Design a protein around this ligand. Structure first.
Ligand code: CUA
Ligand SMILES: [Cu+2]
Ligand SMILES: [Cu+2]
Ligand SMILES: [Zn+2]
Ligand SMILES: [Zn+2]
Ligand SMILES: [Zn+2]
Ligand SMILES: [Zn+2]
Lengths: 382, 218, 213, 100, 51, 213, 52
């Protein structure tokens, strides 16, 4: 929710999410659900999106229907913003605790610095149970174990009510008397200054001194309990460990790529050329969270969101094994309602008709090669 | 009209209440819009209530209305609750929102999205202007107080949120953990903010002269 | 006689309406109001918009239309006895304005504030936008004008004029828009106060101060 | 022209400057793009130029060598403060004083 | 580099994805002109009426 | 008698001069005016500069010098009959100013605009700079002053004064410079208009309106 | 390393070493795109003759 309305080429050429997995589809309150995967920051990052020098690994949901217990880019826990580097692939892991009963479309998203929430695929997860069951316990370096759901709640309230009351008390003191039309006219013809006088100005400095007094008393009383406190921990984490990917064995070349307007399909003419040594076939074209597969070749088992998985969405003019050393040109068609439903079709309103995706190739014994393609994508109407 | 100088007391009174209502909610409305607009906010989150930015901008950006309605309610009524009525307006307006919407609507804990405490300052402003009825005096020591008192004024609420926790291998204060869990989408700072509030009180004292303006047009 | 609970209307009319609204979104915030590209949005939320805009142009035309024509022509000689009753009803208008502003500028505004933090917007027309911008604001503006016109047409002092602070108060909202001044109210009170005290100077108001009170 | 006509006429009917500043400047802003659309549109036909989508207009700038209605609303909303500020600037340029 | 010939000889043809083949030298020229004249005239018409 | 085609001079004097210029650059824009480090630039273009600056200081000194000395000393008593003739000649000076400004501020300005797009500048002294800045601007400023002085020295109303808007109009250009306000004209017309109607109120101008016209 | 501990007026002392810019440079300190190799002392108690 929130992708779809954002520019189709940003969605294509910004971050690619793959090897996504969700530990659970249905979950009880207080239970854990773990999201894993990889993302690539596209080498051809658009203009116009500040490079992800300060990015944040977020979660796309309707507020705290879950809470984020942990998050990890590379091996590292990531509660700050992190510097990601264009071109690199990373593995992430988000760990959610369930908090509100319902049906939630949970996404994994990146937050970028200068302009943009970069929203990955969303999967529906269901939380059963009562919100009154939810606990967020946390042990401090100070001994105590508290519940973050309610920690410091009453304190917060008290101080607010107390100070609010005093606010009222002060206006209340002055409003025993008549407030406007008499006081206004006294000021007018002739002098005011009959309107105020100690005992008024005693009360004035009563309040004034009492206020300063209570603040300092309260503060060094608050310092007395809670003598051990740190400042908010902040600051972008550099040195994110990227994934070391083997150099791919297939290389592809995109000669023209077109889409029908209106339509539900993108054609592209690829010259796939198989270096390395096992007969290779094309199994998937991933484009903007939308996955087009040739079921002749590959079948998702990870339960990828049903609306984004095009089971036999991908057709190759010739998808026989491509022998090692051999190179062929092939016409490929990615085709599925998702192309219209997730509005990739809206690329026609974009000021940069260029797409970008990942192709996944599979050899005989089922091990894979990931090449990335990008190219201009040109409309055809007639 | 009117019959007796006793019914005349009754009208001025049932006026007072009505007018107070107007003045108060019109402040609540426009003052809140001002806090909002001039800050995509620190006030919304416990883990934005920091030692530099929060401590600095908040007093400064907020002196304005108090300063302006101070230049009116005291000048024209000798009513010395100009500053505190503003503050109370913003606070009520926010609490009603934070409770029914930030918690009621979407489910953020209150211990996370509570607003900043504002009254002490306003009291200092109101009283300093009342005693020694010089605006110039208020602008200097009054705005001074308004600025300084702000952080210590919130420290009783804030402090518990600053106990240290080793969360999964990383030092994080409670407040941090809060902002990390509930998913959305350094007294030189005080001095600075006091020294600033002075120019702002001052500029807005004159701005309020204009909103007090009584002309007619054609 | 004097000032009635025609005022009770003014306070409850918004309160009931806007509480029905808060319920209404309360149930369709989730359900329809999440994904704007679903057809349940074009019925429960979009239709809601077209309805309100039309209703607002209409009631604005009727409400301002009404009062401008029932403008008191023979104002030159009508009693202090009614120059009060009227002054009071005027003040009911202002209470309605202030109340209407509260809902717009504080309530639905900082509400939209929370809504932004919880879901990434699919349109410039989220539920909270349909309500904050195109329902809430027109309403308090319409209330605003009414009051202004009532005073100009019903009370001397205000007639033959166009009060600066009042004009500024009422049209001020037309120069408040977001991403990516209403204190005039004072001026306009200090005025409505003087307006109360023409015969009603007496006093009290300078006599029954120098005595009881 | 379209805009200036809206400005001129709106100020003429209901001779209030405040009125012009609001709906007058509103119109001036809004009308502008639709006001250019008949001239502009033919320049936005899509062309596949050497493998890349480009509008005619693009090709033009590319060839002849030198060296989204929220946009409308924004511009209308903005024109208001500008009309307004400049209404008073104009009071000064109308000024008729003499010196020494 | 030296260019020989007549500027009147120059063509800049381009074929759209829309069927039509146009000359960029002069494409949409008349249109541009019309709309500017038309509006310009109306501006004059207005001051004309008052003058 | 009344107002002559001494005006036709004023309109054609710039027109001819500046049309000769547009030809002159037209032929030497290309040829000499491309490479400034060629010696044909230091003759056809640089010498042009030194020539004009000198000619401008001179004509300015002569033109202002002339008029300030032929200032009408016995202004106190001279007829409405000539207080018109003169008022009209003054208006010719203003037509000359406005025409001079056209050439400077519109013509040669947006021309320089095109020139920048087509060649990367070798100097702060391109052809269109020699013409835009150091020929075009001095000329309309000299015309400006002339008019001002004419009015001050030739017409009562303007004498004993220094009009604000007029001063502002004339010296305004001295605070307009580029990288990397002339509306005063109104004030100064609404003045020259009053200046026309001292005896020439009659009218017409209030009489022959209430009748024919 | 420092070549000398005690030095006469007009004489030379030579400081050498290595430095590493930390890979995890903080936020909040602008990357050293424009850095200047200085000397910490109370003004020109020495003068910098050369630096490398
Ligand atoms: Cu948001 Cu699916
Ligand atoms: Cu990628
Ligand atoms: Cu190091
Ligand atoms: Zn399943
Ligand atoms: Zn009595
Ligand atoms: Zn919004
Ligand atoms: Zn230039």
């Amino acid at each position: 929710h929130g992708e779809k309305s954002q520019a189709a080429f940003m969605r294509m050429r910004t971050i690619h999410w793959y090897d996504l997995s969700w530990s659970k589809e249905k979950v009880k309150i207080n239970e854990t659900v773990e999201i894993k995967g990889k993302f690539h920051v596209f080498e051809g990052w658009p203009e116009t999106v500040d490079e992800p020098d300060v990015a944040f690994l977020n979660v796309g949901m309707p507020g705290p229907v879950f809470i984020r217990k942990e998050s990890y880019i590379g091996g590292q826990l990531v509660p700050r913003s992190v510097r990601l580097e264009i071109g690199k692939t990373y593995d992430f892991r988000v760990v959610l605790k369930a908090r509100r009963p319902g049906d939630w479309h949970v996404h994994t998203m990146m937050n970028v610095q200068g302009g943009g929430p970069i929203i990955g695929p969303g999967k529906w997860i269901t939380v059963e149970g009562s919100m009154s069951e939810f606990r967020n316990p946390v042990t401090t370096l100070t001994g105590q174990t508290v519940d973050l759901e309610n920690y410091n709640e009453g304190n917060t309230y008290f101080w607010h009510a107390f100070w609010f009351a005093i606010g009222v008390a002060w206006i209340g003191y002055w409003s025993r008397r008549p407030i406007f039309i008499p006081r206004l006219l006294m000021v007018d013809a002739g002098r005011a200054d009959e309107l105020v006088s100690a005992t008024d100005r005693k009360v004035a400095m009563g309040f004034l001194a009492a206020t300063i007094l209570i603040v300092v008393m309260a503060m060094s009383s608050a310092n007395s309990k809670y003598p051990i406190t740190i400042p908010l921990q902040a600051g972008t984490m550099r040195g994110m460990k990227p994934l070391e990917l083997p150099a791919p064995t297939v290389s592809v070349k995109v000669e023209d790529a077109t889409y029908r307007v209106p339509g539900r399909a993108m054609r592209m003419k690829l010259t796939i050329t198989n270096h390395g040594n096992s007969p290779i076939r094309l199994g998937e074209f991933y484009t903007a969270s939308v996955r087009f597969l040739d079921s002749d070749v590959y079948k998702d088992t990870t339960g990828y969101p049903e609306d984004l998985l095009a089971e036999d969405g991908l057709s190759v003019s010739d998808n026989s094994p491509l022998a090692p050393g051999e190179t062929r040109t092939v016409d490929v068609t990615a085709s599925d309602a998702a192309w219209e439903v997730y509005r990739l079709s809206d690329i026609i309103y974009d000021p940069d008709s260029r797409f970008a995706g990942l192709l996944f190739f599979f050899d005989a014994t089922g091990n894979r090669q990931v090449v990335q393609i990008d190219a201009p994508l040109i409309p055809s109407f007639m | 009209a009117v019959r007796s100088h006793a019914e005349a007391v009754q009208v001025s009174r049932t006026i007072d209440w009505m007018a107070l209502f107007v003045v108060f909610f019109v402040i609540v409305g426009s003052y809140h819009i001002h806090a909002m607009l001039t800050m995509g906010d620190w006030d919304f989150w416990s883990d934005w209530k920091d030692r530099r930015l929060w401590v600095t901008v908040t007093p400064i950006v907020l002196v304005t209305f108090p300063a302006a309605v101070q230049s009116y309610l005291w000048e024209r009524y000798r009513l010395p609750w100009g500053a505190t009525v503003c503050v109370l307006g913003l606070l009520l307006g926010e609490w009603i929102n934070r409770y029914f919407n930030f918690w009621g609507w979407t489910y953020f804990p209150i211990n996370f999205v509570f607003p900043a405490s504002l009254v002490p300052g306003a009291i200092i402003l109101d009283t300093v202007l009342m005693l020694s009825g010089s605006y110039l005096f208020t602008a200097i020591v009054g705005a001074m107080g308004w600025g300084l008192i702000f952080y210590p004024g919130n420290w009783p609420i804030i402090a518990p949120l600053h106990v240290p926790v080793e969360y999964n291998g990383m030092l994080m204060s409670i407040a941090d953990i809060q902002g990390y869990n509930y998913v959305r989408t350094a007294p030189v700072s005080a001095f600075f903010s006091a020294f600033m509030s002075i120019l702002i009180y001052f500029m807005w004292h004159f701005i309020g002269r204009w909103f007090s303006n009584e002309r007619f047009l054609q | 006689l004097l000032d009635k609970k025609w005022l009770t209307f003014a306070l409850a009319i918004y309160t009931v309406f806007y509480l029905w609204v808060r319920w209404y979104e309360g149930v369709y915030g989730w359900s329809a109001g999440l994904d704007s590209f679903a057809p349940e949005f074009e019925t429960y939320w979009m239709n809601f918009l077209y309805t309100e805009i039309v209703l607002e142009i209409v009631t604005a035309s009727i409400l301002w239309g009404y009062l401008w024509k029932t403008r008191d022509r023979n104002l030159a000689a009508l009693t202090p006895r009614e120059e009060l009753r009227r002054n009071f009803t005027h003040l009911v208008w202002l209470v309605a304005y202030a109340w209407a502003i509260y809902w717009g500028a504080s309530y639905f505004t900082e509400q939209d504030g929370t809504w932004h933090q919880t879901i990434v917007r699919d349109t410039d027309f989220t539920p909270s936008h349909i309500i904050e911008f195109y329902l809430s604001y027109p309403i308090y503006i319409i209330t605003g004008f009414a009051a202004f016109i009532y005073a100009k047409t019903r009370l001397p002092f205000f007639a033959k004029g166009i009060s600066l602070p009042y004009l500024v108060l009422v049209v001020g909202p037309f120069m408040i828009l977001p991403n990516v001044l209403a204190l005039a109210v004072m001026g306009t009170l200090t005025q409505t106060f003087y307006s109360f005290a023409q015969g009603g100077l007496g006093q009290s108001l300078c006599e029954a101060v120098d005595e009881g009170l």
